[PDB]
Amino acid sequence: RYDSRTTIFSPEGRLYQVEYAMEAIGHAGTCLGILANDGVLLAAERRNIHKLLDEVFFSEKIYKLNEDMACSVAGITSDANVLTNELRLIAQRYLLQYQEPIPCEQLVTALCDIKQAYTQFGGKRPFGVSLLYIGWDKHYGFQLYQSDPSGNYGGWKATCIGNNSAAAVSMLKQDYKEGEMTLKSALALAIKVLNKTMDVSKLSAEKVEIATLTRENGKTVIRVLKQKEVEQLIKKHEEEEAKAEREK
Amino acid sequence: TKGPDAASKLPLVTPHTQCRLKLLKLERIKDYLLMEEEFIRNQEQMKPLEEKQEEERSKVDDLRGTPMSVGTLEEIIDDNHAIVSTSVGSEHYVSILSFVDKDLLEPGCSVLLNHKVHAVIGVLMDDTDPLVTVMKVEKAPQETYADIGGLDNQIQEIKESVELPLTHPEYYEEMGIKPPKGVILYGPPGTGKTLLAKAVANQTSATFLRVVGSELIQKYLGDGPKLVRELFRVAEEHAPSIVFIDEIDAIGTKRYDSNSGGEREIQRTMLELLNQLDGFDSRGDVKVIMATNRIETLDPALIRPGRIDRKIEFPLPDEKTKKRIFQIHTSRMTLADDVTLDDLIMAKDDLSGADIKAICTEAGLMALRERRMKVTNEDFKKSKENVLYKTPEGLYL
Amino acid sequence: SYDRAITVFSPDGHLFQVEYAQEAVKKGSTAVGVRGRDIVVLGVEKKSVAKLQDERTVRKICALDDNVCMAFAGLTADARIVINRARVECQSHRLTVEDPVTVEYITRYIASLKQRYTQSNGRRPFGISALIVGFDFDGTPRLYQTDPSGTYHAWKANAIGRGAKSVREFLEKNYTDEAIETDDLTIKLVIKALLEVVQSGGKNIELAVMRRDQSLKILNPEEIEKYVAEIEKEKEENE
Amino acid sequence: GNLLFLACYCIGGMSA
Amino acid sequence: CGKTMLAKAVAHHTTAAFIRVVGSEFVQKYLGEGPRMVRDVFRLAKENAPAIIFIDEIDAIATKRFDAQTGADREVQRILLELLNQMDGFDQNVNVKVIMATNRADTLDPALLRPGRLDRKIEFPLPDRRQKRLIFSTIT
Amino acid sequence: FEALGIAQPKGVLLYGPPGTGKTLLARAVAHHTDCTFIRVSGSELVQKFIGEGARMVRELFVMAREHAPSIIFMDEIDSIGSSRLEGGSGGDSEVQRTMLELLNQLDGFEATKNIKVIMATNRIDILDSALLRPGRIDRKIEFPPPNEEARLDILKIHSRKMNLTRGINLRKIAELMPGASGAEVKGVCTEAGMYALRERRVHVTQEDFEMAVAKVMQKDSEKNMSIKKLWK
Amino acid sequence: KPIRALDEGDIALLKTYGQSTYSRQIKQVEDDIQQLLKKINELTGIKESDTGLAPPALWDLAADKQTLQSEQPLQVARCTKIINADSEDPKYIINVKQFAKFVVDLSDQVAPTDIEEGMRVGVDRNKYQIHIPLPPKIDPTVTMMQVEEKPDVTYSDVGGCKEQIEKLREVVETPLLHPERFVNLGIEPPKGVLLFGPPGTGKTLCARAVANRTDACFIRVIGSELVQKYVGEGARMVRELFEMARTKKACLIFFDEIDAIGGDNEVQRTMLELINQLDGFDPRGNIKVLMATNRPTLDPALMRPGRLDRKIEFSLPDLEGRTHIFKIHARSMSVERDIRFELLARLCPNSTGAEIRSVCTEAGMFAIRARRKIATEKDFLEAVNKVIKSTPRYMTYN
Amino acid sequence: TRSEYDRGVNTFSPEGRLFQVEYAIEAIKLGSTAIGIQTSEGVCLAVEKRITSPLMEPSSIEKIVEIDAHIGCAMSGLIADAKTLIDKARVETQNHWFTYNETMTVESVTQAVSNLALQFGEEDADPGAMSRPFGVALLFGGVDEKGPQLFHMDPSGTFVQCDARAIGSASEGAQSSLQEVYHKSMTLKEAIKSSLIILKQVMEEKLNATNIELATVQPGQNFHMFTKEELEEVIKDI
Ligand SMILES: Nc1ncnc2c1ncn2[C@@H]1O[C@H](COP(=O)(O)OP(=O)(O)OP(=O)(O)O)[C@@H](O)[C@H]1O
Ligand SMILES: Nc1ncnc2c1ncn2[C@@H]1O[C@H](COP(=O)(O)OP(=O)(O)OP(=O)(O)O)[C@@H](O)[C@H]1O
Ligand SMILES: Nc1ncnc2c1ncn2[C@@H]1O[C@H](COP(=O)(O)OP(=O)(O)O)[C@@H](O)[C@H]1O
Ligand SMILES: Nc1ncnc2c1ncn2[C@@H]1O[C@H](COP(=O)(O)OP(=O)(O)O)[C@@H](O)[C@H]1O
Ligand SMILES: [Mg+2]
Ligand SMILES: [Mg+2]
Ligand SMILES: [Mg+2]
Structure with missing residues (x-):
């Protein structure tokens, strides 16, 4: 039929290899990014923590790439590492050439040309990876972009990608009041999203990986929440849920 | 030959708001039906007429005996003996009695035979086995071309095929083009093929025979082709006639080398259908209409x-045809003034006539949910995704 | 068979891969360009954003340069790639010749690039059709549809994408010389053309107007409502 | 090759 | 590992009426005969006393359902569907316990692997140490 | 329905994962209706003799029409009505003939009246487009796996006849079932009863339900961490 | 939000309030109309049901009763192997249809010379003695047959097969009307020829055309007719057909769609009968056979040399041929006298002749659509647009 | 089973045919017909428009183009393929005028375009070139030292001098008609009249201004296409 190499065109015009690359992201870990009034936070699921992973890492699903740019990845591990390396290369090449931090849109776009050229020609399989970029630039303040294995991208204020991403996005847009959420409320809403989108009666801070980007003192700080921070936040969430269920 | 069939009552359908114009017309119809009933009850009340010949008829009945079995006159011999097949399938060389109508004897017509020592003692011109009698339409369907939205080219073609030869055909032989013997409607499911067949059976002047395609297949050996032959013989006998075979792909699939007995019988039944289709000349006043969804799977x-x-192609309705169908099915609804119906049509989808009818039904159900009957636009809004169940988002932009 | 090969002619003589690429445009969005006496207008059907998409990065209308603008129908990534290549090439052209790039040259470059992408295995055709518009140095209104067969055609008022045929016939029944006498007349024509397919009105429509070298600004979502108000007023006026 | 087809059955009644 | 032997023992040590069948036996030649046999077996078990239906090699017919594209696969899936609808369908059965043995459970249809039907x-692993000693003793 | 001007709805399909209440809902409808319910569960319409399936469909609908407003339940409609296959040879055609007869009776030239029909399937996507x-x-109608609250209700119906003990929190048990079908919930109740029976008691405790949940919901996972770590 | 099911008061108020004031009257009136319609339908009756009773004075009821009490019925059967009688074993096994098969003997009224394998025979019911052979008779009224002696299709009515018609001429005209050249050339005239090609190419009528110009009668025999209900006796049928072929001065025997036969007990009987008729009849005769097929499924035992001397492929018509067919079919319809049939034939590449006839039919259809008694070139353009083809070819090719 | 050989240009049929190039030949008939006639006074090219929309600008459809003032071109086939061939033709003409400061024979023009063609199965395509046969048939007309000269170029690279050649959709019928129409003593005016008559009896639609493009080459003047008034003049007589 028309399921052959990506440089093929279905009679209906669809790009079947590209379609499968898009769809395969549902097998990856669930991760969302949200944009509060004064910050951008990426939450992600540690799908594989069996018993004996050293956790010798600073973050797994979140890869910082610039003093202004952080990213979350959902897809094949090899393509994830390659995309992160090329991201750092491009961002710092832009820094070297222009001596200004790379704008969000330019960086996301550059990855998108990479991905497109990797499905445009060459007889090579496209990257089966979806990215969530959070960052700041002096043009539009805080920005958050969601990429695509095909090579498309979009600006978003709240976006979940991975397994059970559709229902997570639906309940997120249901529980989103744009322009008026702080970082605390955004974190609480993200935790609600995670609790609803996981197959657990009670999500664990170990399974959850949250990194927050803020701007203060004229500098952008990208920091992953320590286990104490995430455990305190999740216990605040669970006691809030207890109050809510008692009120009903 | 005899004449056509499928009697129908008044269209009525001029008023619908139940404004006693309906009541007056319906009361007139009811009055006429009452005069029917009274007239025939009076005629049966007094009607003494019987006997007369008696003795000759009595002795011919004694000669015929009781019971009398019917068979099919498969072949004739010198004009005293013939070959007649019982309904079982066995045929015998039998004698022909004097009181039979030698002009009526033809290969195929049902012959009344003697129960013992089989011998042709009568001819039955109205055998019409219960199945084929069922396939003949008696009550015309209430649908009509008014109920059909869009498909103007399709209606034009079907009328040019089955109506124009029935009505004044002088254009056909004037151009010398033979009339189109048989027409196949096709398209995606729920486009209106069966609805168009209903509308044809409504505005008709010929015997309409509805068939299911899968109905033709019969368990017993040779029953299939025999039933197909009976159907087409009834079509010719009550000509002009229209033979509608819905879901022709029930038998119309590609012919392949049969292995089992059943598949051989299916091949025989389709071969008989094709032979009967070839048998009558296109100049004849018998037409066929076959509808299907999987046109690509038919034998070429x-x-x-x-x-x-x-x-005839039945494509998915266009936006203008979609709004036409919406207007048609919303005619009996008491829609409010807020409804626009334009948003549903403008949404790029693959709505069909069946889909639009279901959307209207579900909108009515949603209105009944809110204890209302005025049906807001929000009712349609919900119903559209209620009944429309099931390209990766931003890939194409 | 003969369909899964970009560079194999069918027995009847067709390049079926290129035809499939051509058809892939029809699954995009409606984009119509109308050239006026002193204006060139581009109307594009805008997808409705559900609740969160940032519309500042959903650009369906873009300008290759000051004197050239364009609308696309097809997959976004191909359009972005060809946009980058063509705008870089425009700057290279101005490196070579120092005069502003004419519409015909950039259109021919885009068509040649698509053709070279549609001439060997291991290279997928650019499944995008682009309506380019612009004024030359002397300000002649020009408009060209470029097609993934790597070709172009100079239309006075063309439509691409889904529903391209409907808008095309609307223009054929509506395109008149007097209809481009003023900018507002062309605006009325393009608004009616867009409303022919996008019956919602209000939003879901993006308009771009380029006059004699003003570096066109896309119509902000305040005066387009005024334009559809004028259209409705005229419609109720005639009847 | 991978045909593996089922089989139907059409009886013929017979008697005299 | 002992599946068919455990079934043999259950048949020996029971007052129930035992209907031993094998999955490949269900797949008949004539169209619709397989599902008819399934219906006949379950009807017989129902009409008799508390009965046991043992279907050895259930993966003959109960492999995971898929988009069958030919008559044979359609008929096999029809047999599987008839088995499902007979086991936990509309008309519930009373005192009819079914036993089915397979070597590859992971290939079975999930509709057959749900409570109410199965x-x-029970997993029958290879004997582990102590079990091996019991086997050696009871065969020696 | 007449006053609204709408057409009377005719058929309804119950689709969902294997074991959610579809057959249970049909049984309930049969129990709580005055209509002459008809169980025509799939593959009963597939006879060896040619054309007999279509004939039985015709007789079924004629007989339903002869009786009062009737309900026909085609359980596992996936069997006969799945999808018309191109051509014959190895393709199935007699079953497709029966399916086509069913389609025509459902909505054909005759437009049957008061023959509401219910069908059930675990795989709606493969059903013929002319049937859906x-x-x-x-x-x-879709029957999704029950959520936490619905699981609590299902536990409470299936634990109604048990001999519970004071201090039982069925809510915790329902929370112990991420995405478990109702059939699995009933199986959990049965296994808890079995655990109580093993110790020759009549009451069941919370730990009985916990280990019943562990046993019933047990499923084989991806043993190879390398395979499981392909995706991020 | 949990929606509330309608309660009894809800249902009662729904049926009223928002109702037309005439609801009860109208619905009741419609119900009585339907009831009265069913009343009339059940009471009107059936009527005759008039059996085939002859007019009186044609009745010999006395003799009819005599025949009823004297004459006896005979079941018919297909007689099978003769068992090599030689006047001492005259038994034959006969198959009475779907009934059984019995080995029986003759009645005294029939000689064994009248009985042979494969003929329908009427026999008694207990001894099953073959009482009378029942030849199936030959008549164009039954089935379909040659039904033609001098076809009305002439050499001017055929186009697009110039090489094919030339080959056919060499096949049939040269040996039939010019036997002297074959005789003095000392070469056996072509005993067998096959005409293979796709359906609708025109094959049949081509032979029919030469059948008009060969001064010999044309024979049409349909293989499906041999394989459908008219199976079995068909062998004997063609026997008689071949027999009548011998009776006439010259017969152009041709079998339509031999694929139904060339690719089955009685079918094989008909085949072997054809083999005997061809290989047995003297090749010097004048009843030369024309063979045609769509699927070159023919048994290898057929085209062995001495049975099929020549093969002719009927390919799709060319530009000249297609335009000739267009003009030929336009001769029979009311069109203008300035139609560019070359244009249309160009517009119909690889189109069968039957397709061309259908194109002309659709042109007439479109002319009727506009109620114009003269079809125009526009009408033919829409007809070819519809039939043929059942942006891409204009936005890339120019 | 022909199907095993139509896949790829580098395959030989059992009859030793080039099925791929034959399909490329058939791809011409998808294009519109082009007629070129050669006479003593010059060479004239008439091409249809096959317009799709009235809104289509006539200039955009280029069924006749000039390689040089002295030489005119007609093409039938893929428009992008034709444009590449035509740009190569103009480049090679400019190359000859650079090296020799002279205008080449149209025979040399077809020679160089042919070397651009028939390169599909050549190893020199490593930097990038045609991997498939070219999909346009060409018609060269001009006036050189040998007087008027007309050549017809096949996509396989075959070139033939022709007194009159019709290619495109209606190649066969137009060629057959010209076979009887053509006389070696044709004058330019009568030649153009005959060409327009052939178009009339070959065209699908009525001959108006916006269906026919027309070009002339004579030893005196250069390549000349008929302007709107000029084509109106050449169309009023017919
Ligand atoms: N053009 C139309 N206008 C109004 N109603 C329509 C139209 N087309 C279809 N419908 C509605 O669709 C319903 C079902 O249509 P119909 O029975 O003709 O289907 P079909 O297209 O023949 O499909 P199938 O043969 O696959 O069942 C009709 O009862 C009618 O109400
Ligand atoms: N929501 C529920 N409430 C109560 N009991 C339930 C529920 N879901 C399932 N069950 C019980 O679990 C079993 C499920 O079997 P059932 O056949 O009724 O389900 P199903 O979804 O129709 O399955 P199948 O796909 O096999 O038809 C039954 O014994 C039923 O009593
Ligand atoms: N637990 C056991 N005790 C005694 N013999 C055993 C045991 N398990 C296996 N066997 C031997 O192995 C065979 C097991 O057959 P079985 O396991 O029933 O086949 P399957 O597993 O394919 O149904 C028996 O014939 C028996 O001789
Ligand atoms: N050479 C021809 N001359 C005239 N008519 C032709 C020719 N070829 C085909 N036809 C048309 O095709 C139609 C069908 O031809 P027919 O002989 O039935 O096809 P086949 O050869 O498959 O039997 C005829 O009605 C005839 O009008
Ligand atoms: Mg229908
Ligand atoms: Mg075993
Ligand atoms: Mg069930």
């Missing part, structure tokens, strides 16, 4: 120009 |  |  001999010239 | 999915 | 078409099948 059934749709030959020498067998079925026309091929 | 309440207990 | 509205007007033949309206209200394609």
